[PDB]
Curated annotation (Swiss-Prot):
Shown residues in whole-protein numbering: 3 to 168 of 414
Assembly mode: Interacts (via PPxY motifs) with NEDD4 (via WW domains). Interacts with ADRB2. Interacts with ADRB3. Interacts with HGS (via PPxY motifs). Does not bind TXN (thioredoxin). Interacts with ITCH. Interacts with WWP1 (via WW domains).
Organism: Homo sapiens (Human)
Tissue-specificity statement: Highly expressed in skeletal muscle, placenta, kidney, lung, liver, blood, adrenal gland, lymph node, mammary gland, thyroid, and trachea. Very low levels in colon, thymus, spleen, small intestine, bladder and bone marrow. Strong expression in differentiated adipocytes compared to preadipocytes. Detected in omental fat and subcutaneous fat tissue.
Source taxonomy: Eukaryota, Metazoa, Chordata, Craniata, Vertebrata
Name of the featured protein: Arrestin domain-containing protein 3
Subcellular location: Cytoplasm; Cell membrane; Lysosome; Endosome
Superkingdom field: Eukaryota
Primary gene name: ARRDC3
Family affiliation: Belongs to the arrestin family.
UniProt induction comment: By troglitazone and pioglitazone (selective PPARG agonists), by prostaglandin J2 (PGJ2) and by L165,041 (a PPARD ligand), by vitamin D3 and, to a lesser extent, by phorbol myristate acetate (PMA) in the promyelocytic leukemia HL-60 cells. No induction by retinoic acid, nor by clofibrate (a specific PPARA agonist). Up-regulated by fasting.
Function, as annotated: Adapter protein that plays a role in regulating cell-surface expression of adrenergic receptors and probably also other G protein-coupled receptors. Plays a role in NEDD4-mediated ubiquitination and endocytosis af activated ADRB2 and subsequent ADRB2 degradation. May recruit NEDD4 to ADRB2. Alternatively, may function as adapter protein that does not play a major role in recruiting NEDD4 to ADRB2, but rather plays a role in a targeting ADRB2 to endosomes.
Amino acid sequence: LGKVKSLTISFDCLNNVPVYSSGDTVSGRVNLEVTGEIRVKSLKIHARGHAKVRWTESRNTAYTQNYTEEVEYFNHKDILIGHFHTIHSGRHEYAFSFELPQTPLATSFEGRHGSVRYWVKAELHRPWLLPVKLKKEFTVFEHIDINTPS
């Protein structure tokens, strides 16, 4: 058997910053470095954008209950491998490409308990091993429209 050394995600920028807008094609490669030899059930990507709010509330022998509320603006899945596949030592690259809705999207923002975030998640499934995921954030900002209603 072998083992996964590294799992990263590279973005093909439109420049060099991962900033995107409506109708834009977000693409890149899922990078996978491995020592020895591993078997892979599947390699999937999951893109999502949503508004998110964290808050905690104290109870009582006291403890703290954690809450999170999300509103989805965008969601997209795709498979890159399978759905076993064998991979040997060295670097491996797997290209991905999807597109953002031509409908207007929420702009990325970071408040103190509220935020809007977009990310691409890479999910690796292997026989007799727990699923491993890597989530990399990208920024979405709408381009100006001179025909905006009121």
